[PDB]
Enzyme design. Structure first.
Site, PDB file in Angstrom:
ATOM      1  N   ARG A   1     -70.612 -10.652  80.156  1.00 32.74           N
ATOM      2  CA  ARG A   1     -69.376 -11.146  80.952  1.00 32.74           C
ATOM      3  C   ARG A   1     -69.789 -12.429  81.266  1.00 32.74           C
ATOM      4  NH1 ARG A   1     -67.463  -6.086  84.592  1.00 32.74           N
ATOM      5  NH2 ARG A   1     -66.315  -4.900  83.045  1.00 32.74           N
TER       6      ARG A   1
ATOM      7  N   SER B   1     -62.277 -23.731  71.485  1.00 37.30           N
ATOM      8  CA  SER B   1     -61.105 -23.375  70.583  1.00 37.30           C
ATOM      9  C   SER B   1     -59.809 -23.259  71.279  1.00 37.30           C
ATOM     10  CB  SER B   1     -61.469 -22.195  69.560  1.00 37.30           C
ATOM     11  OG  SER B   1     -61.438 -20.929  70.388  1.00 37.30           O
TER      12      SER B   1
ATOM     13  N   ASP C   1     -69.075 -10.480  73.083  1.00 37.97           N
ATOM     14  CA  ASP C   1     -67.767  -9.720  73.628  1.00 37.97           C
ATOM     15  C   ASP C   1     -68.033  -8.752  74.325  1.00 37.97           C
ATOM     16  OD1 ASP C   1     -65.181  -8.400  74.016  1.00 37.97           O
ATOM     17  OD2 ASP C   1     -64.393  -9.988  72.602  1.00 37.97           O
TER      18      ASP C   1
ATOM     19  N   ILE D   1     -58.428 -15.320  67.741  1.00 31.45           N
ATOM     20  CA  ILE D   1     -59.371 -16.809  67.445  1.00 31.45           C
ATOM     21  C   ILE D   1     -60.689 -16.658  67.078  1.00 31.45           C
ATOM     22  CG2 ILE D   1     -59.920 -19.132  67.989  1.00 31.45           C
ATOM     23  CD1 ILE D   1     -57.275 -19.217  70.284  1.00 31.45           C
TER      24      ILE D   1
ATOM     25  N   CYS E   1     -53.474 -25.123  68.297  1.00 29.84           N
ATOM     26  CA  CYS E   1     -52.780 -24.891  67.178  1.00 29.84           C
ATOM     27  C   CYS E   1     -51.636 -25.931  67.201  1.00 29.84           C
ATOM     28  CB  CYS E   1     -52.304 -23.634  66.956  1.00 29.84           C
ATOM     29  SG  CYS E   1     -51.269 -23.044  67.931  1.00 29.84           S
TER      30      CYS E   1
ATOM     31  N   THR F   1     -47.851 -14.162  70.421  1.00 24.77           N
ATOM     32  CA  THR F   1     -49.122 -14.347  70.561  1.00 24.77           C
ATOM     33  C   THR F   1     -49.594 -13.112  71.395  1.00 24.77           C
ATOM     34  OG1 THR F   1     -49.044 -15.486  72.878  1.00 24.77           O
ATOM     35  CG2 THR F   1     -48.992 -16.792  70.602  1.00 24.77           C
TER      36      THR F   1
ATOM     37  N   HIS G   1     -42.254 -21.002  68.138  1.00 28.62           N
ATOM     38  CA  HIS G   1     -43.545 -20.150  67.953  1.00 28.62           C
ATOM     39  C   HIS G   1     -43.769 -18.603  67.698  1.00 28.62           C
ATOM     40  CE1 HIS G   1     -47.677 -19.729  68.520  1.00 28.62           C
ATOM     41  NE2 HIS G   1     -48.143 -21.163  68.738  1.00 28.62           N
TER      42      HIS G   1
END
Lengths: 334, 334, 334, 334
Positions: free
Chosen positions: C79, C121, C34, C13, C151, C181, C178
């Site tokens: 983190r 998100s 990240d 995402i 989504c 993922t 689906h």
């Protein structure tokens, strides 16, 4: 089976070594360690398998133990391998299958808890390495920590042994078209050390480095420095194939290669090296326990000294059965 | 962007040659023949593509013609190629893409309807074969029926040309790990002539025969009899890879091979032979128009005379763009 | 003029929101956090995408920053989200995309580092939830932490809004077929909390629980308690489909449903809710930026009050573009 | 005293009906007709199966016959079914499995060659239709040409029978998430009558029409006009799942539905309708011989009158075993 075995890690190799042990009856699993999978979940993961089908037998959780075919197995949940009480559970040999304790120093932590020997079900940078049917006679009782090499080395080494013994391998280059593994990702994700391995496993042919052909040179010392190769990971759930392109010292017509491989498959390498002339495809080797099955029809010779030899391997079940066979061989020498 | 082209067959190659013609603008498609696909279905098959996405433009059926980006295309529905009125539709060159009229006798039927030249988008047992960037300068106006070889020969020949020109290929054996094709089956079904090819394409790695490496000896005559190989079909929808294991006459360190391939990709073979040092996987070449892209990181050398070289190819789009480039080159010589 | 955005997490995402921001130009990405993906690896992961193809522009690592189309982006590796210095980087809005800081308390940690607003998100147990085209006009400047739902909720809610507004949904049950993922496994592996989700993604149809249909009742308050559903994960890399079986209060002939959905797709929901009568399949929506595309031909009515409605969604690209649209809408209200 | 059977077509259904006949021992296959598959190829296609594994008995070609477990089978190669000499081979019942002779007029051609009865292993527009465990007691000796319905009707009808008998189905809409079949294409190809079915099977979720739910109303007359549905083809090689969304007349708590289905699975529908509370996925039903297996954990209720019920089916082996069970039942009534 006589030797009592402990399994460290209940991932794909750990579970299939456990399944091979009970299917073959050659060894007795008495303990399993996994800090992330609890007992009720171990019952489920062992009972149902997408690739190899439901376990043919009984499996249940009873009094904090995993009971498979009436055999109770002690379950440990330790992150530190030196804290696993293998000796209290009666585990004489430990299969180190997590893939993160592959040096003799790290795998040796199991000796602190009372294990007598450790078999690393993966390549090791320093432990003695064995391939059943190729150098297992070099094993002796003084070796407490050994490695069973990888699934790919177990496919290539039996074939390379027969070819080298009869014609001599001057040099060879290997490609393995390999089924997907647990280290791969479903969609493009982080891998960090091996960037291509993070790419979506369903969508891609992924080149990968492998020390499998080089490792054959350690198991068959005369081939040290004469072999190397690489791999392509492809979207199949199981079963892989080796493609060995080699130069031979003595001339070998393709029918002479077929003759010697067929003879080896019927004698000293029976059950290790298979041989077929049938129009096989990868799914024909699903749950096949051979280390290597020579495909006579798929290979091709350019001339008497330059050939491409093809051999199939169930990368999960062949290798898992060899771990059990290695432990049975070790037990017979005690 | 001048020669007017007719396409025989609206299968995978026919549709993607049409897409390459409109996307590159190098040739003008004026006619399509297909006796089994009617006009309204051609609109649908051309507009939507699972592999290469929706067509970027307009596609409509109008007055019995297929209209792409406002350009009307005459549609024929003849089973007998000698009955197609190519000349009346204004089609000067015909792409023979059905895969069943690959001899000069069978492909020559298009000359009866008024075509001036025929390009067989497949290997031919007797037509002159060309690979762009390798022997297209040997084309001459006297040749009315030619072949553009296969997608695999177009991948191997540019790389083999550079390697042979700089170091000399004494001998080589090729393996192609190939994406699935229209001749394969979704589940185990009848194939009759090639039993392994009938096995389920989604479930299997399937060994297969290919004359692609042998065909490189026809486009590069010095390599005649020095190359052969085989293929493995794997469950990916598109993009394939060649693995050439060859013996070199002159010593070549792997960095020297990288240097000459990179130089060729930047000069005479620009747009045909690519070069990359990135951590690529097959999906990175989806809709890539190169014939061959050398993967520097994936290959491996055993020594200075024995190496394994890896090259990627979009087996659908690279080849389809080469058919258009071959026709544009032919048009420039008229 | 454009709001400056920080992205927490460079997973699927996070990367596709970053790509949608550069492709649409509606917001300016100035920072990415990240802790597990370093800068050189971020270049690779952003540049190459198995599903959506290579990034159109330029991507490179320069002076410790990620430079996309000449725009330098500050890279953090924290983190703890309360330690990210969003303010030093100039990031005004933060997209919280890791999937582990979805409560207002956890997502609010980004305000400590100087962010002004946070967009989760993913679904949130307590943050206000929005779906563009359905309730985004309920957003106001007092809301510093909001969620863009999932989504699947973004696919179902626009369709449910049109159906409920015109005919009234008495009750409905949804199934989503689906695509795989990142939380799934390549081969049978440990999942712990959700046992079925650990089973091999390439081999199985996997039932799964989802709160997406229930969440539509929070975005469309009149449908609270009137919808629920479940999912089947299937082995496709991307693109999913919703199957809404609902009971309508007013009679609705299938042509009347098509008429109102088509009108909504051409007016207030243009770019959010699509409409098609073409013979589409899932790959036709790869990289499609709609939230929902009604498939007129795929649905079926039993009678005027009981129907099954089908709507496609690119679960990666539709949702990522909605995150960018929601941030552009929020910026217009400052 | 077992009925002698002839099988027309050695496609997927024909081979697996043959395999079920030898595995169950309920009937004796004495003849097989297939104009496109010769004897040596039938040995190969029967011996190796990508989905169900190798045949564990023996198979060989001997004196122009296919010998399975020592039983010789006469082989015919006729395109016209009225020319097959079933009587000369001793075949009493013929399984019409080609999918091309499904009307009573076309299937009746087998009576010309000496067959006594014909079982169409597919839906028929006019032959009497049966589902074992639902209406097989309505079969009588006057019926010479019958149909065993489809794999999907055999999954839905046993479940719909139990639900309707206990709570009353007011109306229902079904979706089947179906594994790929032999009528699909590996890559985008021609399918003139059903355009979506020509799209690449490995890349897509494909909506498809099915008369299976409507056919349940012919097998259970009290549900005629109360059910309809559609299908999604997904890239799995085998095993499918039904998702029945129905409105019930009597209130039914989800635990009451589970109790009633479990009781039916243990009594009158034993071996036909299964029941599980385990965390199953599709591969857990590979080679499962049930027609339908209710998944208690996967279903969901919105309220006491509106529920979604899930049932798995091995679309190949469940249906093939029902064809054998239907013939064994017919034989017992002679």
């Amino acid at each position: 089976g006589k030797v009592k075995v402990g399994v460290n890690g209940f991932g794909r190799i750990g579970r299939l070594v456990t399944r091979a042990a009970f299917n073959s009856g050659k060894v007795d699993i008495v303990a399993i360690n996994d800090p992330f999978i609890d007992l009720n979940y171990m019952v489920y993961m062992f009972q149902y398998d997408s690739t190899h089908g439901k376990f043919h037998g009984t499996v249940k959780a009873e009094n904090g133990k995993l009971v498979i075919n009436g055999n109770p197995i002690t379950i440990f949940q330790e992150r530190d391998p030196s804290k696993i009480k293998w000796g209290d559970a009666g585990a004489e040999y430990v299969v180190e299958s997590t893939g993160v304790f592959t040096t003799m120093e790290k795998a040796g932590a199991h000796l602190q808890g009372g294990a007598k020997r450790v078999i690393i079900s993966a390549p090791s940078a320093d432990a003695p390495m064995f391939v059943m049917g190729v150098n297992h006679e070099k094993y002796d009782n003084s070796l407490k920590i050994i490695s069973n090499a990888s699934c790919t080395t177990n496919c290539l080494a039996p074939l390379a042994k027969v070819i080298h013994d009869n014609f001599g391998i001057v040099e060879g280059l290997m490609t393995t078209v390999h089924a997907i593994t647990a280290t791969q990702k479903t969609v493009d994700g982080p891998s960090g050390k091996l960037w291509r391995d993070g790419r979506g496993a369903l969508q891609n042919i992924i080149p990968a480095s492998t020390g499998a052909a080089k490792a054959v040179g350690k198991v068959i010392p005369e081939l040290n420095g004469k072999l190397t190769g690489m791999a392509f990971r492809v979207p199949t759930a199981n079963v892989s194939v080796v493609d060995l392109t080699c130069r031979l010292e003595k001339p070998a017509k393709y029918d002479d290669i077929k003759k010697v491989v067929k003879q080896a498959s019927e004698g000293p390498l029976k059950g290790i090296l298979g041989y077929t002339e049938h129009q096989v495809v990868s799914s024909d080797f699903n749950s096949d326990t051979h280390s290597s099955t020579f495909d006579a029809g798929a290979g091709i010779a350019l001339n008497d000294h330059f050939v491409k030899l093809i051999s199939w391997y169930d990368n999960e079940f062949g290798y898992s059965n060899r771990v059990v066979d290695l432990m049975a061989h070790m037990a017979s020498k005690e």
